[PDB]
Ligand binder design. Sequence first.
Ligand SMILES: CS(=O)(=O)NCCCNCc1ccc(-c2ccccc2)c(Cl)c1
Length: 326
Amino acid sequence: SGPVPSRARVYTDVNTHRPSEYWDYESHVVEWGNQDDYQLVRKLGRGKYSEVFEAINITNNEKVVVKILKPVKKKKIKREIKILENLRGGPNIITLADIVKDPVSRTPALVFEHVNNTDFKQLYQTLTDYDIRFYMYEILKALDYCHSMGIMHRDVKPHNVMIDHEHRKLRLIDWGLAEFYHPGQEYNVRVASRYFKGPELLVDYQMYDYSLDMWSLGCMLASMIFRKEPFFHGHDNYDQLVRIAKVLGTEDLYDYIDKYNIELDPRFNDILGRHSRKRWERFVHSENQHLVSPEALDFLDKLLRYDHQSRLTAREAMEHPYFYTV
Ligand SMILES: CS(=O)(=O)NCCCNCc1ccc(-c2ccccc2)c(Cl)c1
């Protein structure tokens, strides 16, 4: 038979009921601006096919962020531009302000609202249980919103979450891997960053949905409340599944792959082994006990499930008792 088909439990047909103009990014008409309105200040980082810079919009003396894209694949740039335009104004979503080209080098660049990020390697051991609840809820607002718009982010991780702690401002960034969800579509599993990859990706189950972002969110929450970064520390994509199996156990892994009739890659034969299901309390230690609670453990247990259909949706997650104090 092949693998059993699957579809999202929420926002299943949002793109189906919309015109082609919304989701057909290949037909989208991009109108470039003039990069002369912007003066580059400093480098903020470097990605696989992008260099991010802090800049000045000289026409109003306002700070902006400029992402210069290595134009490796045109279809992918068009996809990101369309999704960004589509999501513009959503809660906690980076705002694409302009799209410009270097008049001379002709390289594409995306211009965004400036976010004053506070350091990730400093924003730790000062953060409280309340702060973790607060920021997790702000990320869920972003996720429920983009999922409601028929988009899955597919690269949820701490590097893609910008926080201005002084102003308690959060922005979900880097929509370069984002995609339109269409029920029954088979997607490329070479998405997300290793530590944040959902079991569906590691077993090569192509018919995934929004729930993939919910696995990634669980990995970020686990690393935050247990002070273990990353939580699942795989050295490769095959080893990544083994690290998950050391926590969730091999019994539920076999239940998952049987339910979807997934063929497990021969490379897992000699590395998977047998593992018991671990209790979440096993990860509580003196360094992290002030951040852990029965509510946090119950919430995590509902996100970190092999079965992508059994994971909380972003809206069910926002209703969880872990967020009653927010
Ligand atoms: C250089 S750049 O483009 O600004 N990127 C760099 C991003 C820096 N990340 C900052 C970050 C992201 C997430 C969380 C987090 C908060 C609550 C729950 C889970 C995670 C924290 Cl503490 C810090």
